[PDB]
Design a protein around this motif. Structure first.
Motif, PDB file in Angstrom:
ATOM      1  N   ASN A  51       1.060  -1.007  -0.317  1.00 13.78           N
ATOM      2  CA  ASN A  51       0.235  -0.015  -0.388  1.00 13.78           C
ATOM      3  C   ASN A  51       0.834   1.109  -0.284  1.00 13.78           C
ATOM      4  O   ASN A  51       1.788   0.968   0.181  1.00 13.78           O
ATOM      5  CB  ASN A  51      -1.006   0.225   1.285  1.00 13.78           C
ATOM      6  N   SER A  52       0.226   2.714   0.180  1.00 16.61           N
ATOM      7  CA  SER A  52       0.571   3.662  -0.184  1.00 16.61           C
ATOM      8  C   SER A  52       2.221   3.943   0.594  1.00 16.61           C
ATOM      9  O   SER A  52       2.871   3.672   0.569  1.00 16.61           O
ATOM     10  CB  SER A  52      -0.511   4.565  -0.766  1.00 16.61           C
ATOM     11  N   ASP A  98      -0.869   0.263  -8.990  1.00 17.51           N
ATOM     12  CA  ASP A  98      -2.235  -0.021  -8.535  1.00 17.51           C
ATOM     13  C   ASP A  98      -1.930  -1.535  -7.890  1.00 17.51           C
ATOM     14  O   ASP A  98      -0.897  -1.969  -8.047  1.00 17.51           O
ATOM     15  CB  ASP A  98      -3.072   0.034  -9.719  1.00 17.51           C
ATOM     16  N   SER A  99      -3.018  -1.945  -7.173  1.00 21.58           N
ATOM     17  CA  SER A  99      -2.882  -3.718  -6.652  1.00 21.58           C
ATOM     18  C   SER A  99      -2.911  -4.774  -7.135  1.00 21.58           C
ATOM     19  O   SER A  99      -3.011  -4.446  -9.080  1.00 21.58           O
ATOM     20  CB  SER A  99      -3.990  -3.627  -5.774  1.00 21.58           C
ATOM     21  N   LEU A 101      -5.191  -6.818  -7.609  1.00 28.39           N
ATOM     22  CA  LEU A 101      -7.019  -7.266  -7.885  1.00 28.39           C
ATOM     23  C   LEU A 101      -7.170  -6.213  -8.391  1.00 28.39           C
ATOM     24  O   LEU A 101      -8.278  -6.456  -9.568  1.00 28.39           O
ATOM     25  CB  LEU A 101      -7.661  -6.850  -6.256  1.00 28.39           C
ATOM     26  N   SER A 102      -6.516  -4.682  -8.626  1.00 23.85           N
ATOM     27  CA  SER A 102      -6.650  -4.198  -9.809  1.00 23.85           C
ATOM     28  C   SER A 102      -6.810  -4.426 -10.859  1.00 23.85           C
ATOM     29  O   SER A 102      -7.167  -3.969 -12.182  1.00 23.85           O
ATOM     30  CB  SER A 102      -6.605  -2.586  -9.602  1.00 23.85           C
ATOM     31  N   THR A 103      -5.584  -5.222 -11.433  1.00 24.69           N
ATOM     32  CA  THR A 103      -5.900  -6.103 -13.077  1.00 24.69           C
ATOM     33  C   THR A 103      -4.809  -4.920 -13.645  1.00 24.69           C
ATOM     34  O   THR A 103      -4.729  -4.986 -14.362  1.00 24.69           O
ATOM     35  CB  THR A 103      -6.221  -6.874 -13.501  1.00 24.69           C
ATOM     36  N   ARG A 104      -4.865  -3.600 -12.993  1.00 19.63           N
ATOM     37  CA  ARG A 104      -3.684  -3.213 -13.861  1.00 19.63           C
ATOM     38  C   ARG A 104      -2.566  -2.919 -14.578  1.00 19.63           C
ATOM     39  O   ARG A 104      -2.149  -2.986 -15.438  1.00 19.63           O
ATOM     40  CB  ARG A 104      -3.623  -1.112 -13.489  1.00 19.63           C
ATOM     41  N   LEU A 106      -2.502  -6.102 -16.166  1.00 21.99           N
ATOM     42  CA  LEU A 106      -2.675  -6.685 -17.410  1.00 21.99           C
ATOM     43  C   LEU A 106      -2.558  -5.585 -18.644  1.00 21.99           C
ATOM     44  O   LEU A 106      -2.961  -5.551 -19.706  1.00 21.99           O
ATOM     45  CB  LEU A 106      -4.047  -7.466 -17.440  1.00 21.99           C
TER      46      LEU A 106
END
Lengths: 121, 207
Positions: A51-52, A98-99, A101-104, A106
Motif C-alpha cells: 500500500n501507499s 496499482d494493486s 486485484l485491480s489488474t492494472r 495486465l
C-alpha cells in the motif's frame, strides 16, 4: 506514466537479488504498487503488492517468507528483495502501478519494461 | 435489544448505479456477440442473449455488501456492528473503484477494489485462501434463474485464483472499455482500461 525496473540478473539457487523500479509521471505516494512476473511459456502472475504508506504488504503463498516488498516514497522507488531463490523463480519481473486485484498490470501502459531473473547452476 | 441490519454495505447513488448497470448490460451484449464466446457456448450451457440469461437483476440501486448480519443471527455480526469504524462511517459517502467485469454460467458482476479506508470496513472462508483481504468485494449485476446473489462473490474469488497464477491466458479480445480474457469453464473477465468510479453510501439494509 513511467516505470523503470533494474536489479535483475543470473544467480545460483539459494542466492539473492534486489529489484528496483523508479516511478515518474504520477503521484507515487498515492498508489498501491505491485510486482508481477511471467515465466517462460506462462502468463503474467502475481508476486507481491504494497500500500501507499507501506504499512500493508501482500505476497503469494509461493514467495511468502522469501521475498520482501518495500518502498521509499521520497525517492519514488519500489523494491523487491528476493532471497532463497529457486529455479521456479526464473521469470521476467515487472513493476506495475496499482494493486494486483485491480489488474492494472495486465495493461501495457501500467507496467514497466521488465527485468530478467534467472536462477540456475 | 435492537436488531442489526440484514446486511451492511455501500449503496450506490442512482446516478452511479445507472452508469454501472448500463456498462454491465453493454458488456453482456458485446460478450454474447463475440466469436470467442460463441465458440465456447458448450462450456457455458442459434445464439444466447446473455441479458436474458441473467434474468434476475438487482432491484433499486446496486450495492457492494460488506458484512451479512441477518439482523444479528450471523456469526460475527455483533462484533462487526460494534466496531468504531463501522459506527463512525454509517451514513457516510465513499467512492468505490470498479476495475473489472465478469461473467460465469451463474452470475455477472463487477469487481470492486477498495481503498485502505474502505478495507477497514471489510469484515475479518476456504475459497479465498492466499488472496489479499477484500478480494471478494463486488457488485452483483445479474444471476441465472436458479442462482442466489451470494454466488457472485464466490465466482469472483474463483476467477481471482486463476488470475493469481497467470492462467487467465492471453487476451482474446479488445472491447471498447478494456481487455477480455477467457478463463475456461464458462468464465470471462473484462479488465477495464480505466477504473470506473462510483459514489456510494455505507449504511445498513433491513429488507
Amino acid at each position: 506514466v513511467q516505470l523503470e525496473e533494474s536489479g535483475g540478473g543470473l544467480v545460483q539457487p539459494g542466492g539473492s537479488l534486489r529489484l528496483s523500479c523508479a516511478a515518474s509521471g504520477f503521484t507515487f505516494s498515492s498508489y498501491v504498487m505491485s510486482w508481477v512476473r511471467q515465466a517462460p511459456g506462462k502468463g503474467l502472475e502475481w508476486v507481491s503488492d504494497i500500500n501507499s504508506g507501506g504499512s500493508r504488504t501482500y505476497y503469494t503463498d509461493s514467495v511468502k517468507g522469501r521475498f520482501t516488498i518495500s518502498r521509499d516514497n521520497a525517492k519514488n522507488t519500489l523494491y523487491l528483495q528476493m532471497n532463497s531463490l529457486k529455479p521456479e523463480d526464473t521469470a521476467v519481473y515487472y513493476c506495475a502501478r496499482d494493486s494486483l486485484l485491480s489488474t492494472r498490470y495486465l495493461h501495457t501502459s501500467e507496467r514497466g519494461q521488465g527485468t530478467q531473473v534467472t536462477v540456475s547452476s | 435489544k435492537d436488531f442489526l441490519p440484514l446486511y451492511f454495505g455501500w449503496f450506490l447513488t442512482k446516478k452511479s448505479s445507472e452508469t454501472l448497470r448500463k456498462a454491465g448490460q453493454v458488456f453482456l451484449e458485446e460478450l454474447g456477440n463475440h466469436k470467442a464466446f460463441k465458440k465456447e457456448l458448450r462450456h457455458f450451457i442459434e445464439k444466447l442473449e446473455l441479458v436474458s440469461y441473467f434474468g434476475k437483476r438487482p432491484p433499486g440501486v446496486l450495492h457492494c455488501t460488506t458484512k451479512f448480519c441477518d439482523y444479528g443471527k450471523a456469526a460475527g455480526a455483533e462484533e462487526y456492528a460494534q466496531q468504531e469504524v463501522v459506527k463512525r462511517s454509517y451514513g457516510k459517502a465513499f467512492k468505490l473503484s470498479i476495475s473489472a467485469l465478469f461473467v460465469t454460467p451463474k452470475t455477472a458482476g463487477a469487481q470492486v477494489v477498495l481503498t485502505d479506508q474502505e478495507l477497514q470496513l471489510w469484515p475479518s472462508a476456504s475459497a479465498s485462501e492466499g488472496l489479499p483481504p477484500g478480494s471478494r468485494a463486488h457488485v452483483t449485476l445479474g444471476c441465472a434463474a436458479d442462482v442466489q446473489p451470494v454466488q457472485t462473490g464466490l465466482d469472483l474469488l474463483d476467477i481471482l485464483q486463476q488470475v493469481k497464477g497467470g492462467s487467465q491466458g492471453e487476451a482474446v479480445g479488445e472491447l471498447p472499455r478494456g481487455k477480455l480474457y477467457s478463463l475456461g469453464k464458462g468464465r470471462w473477465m473484462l479488465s477495464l482500461t480505466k477504473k470506473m468510479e462510483v459514489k456510494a453510501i455505507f449504511t445498513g439494509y433491513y429488507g
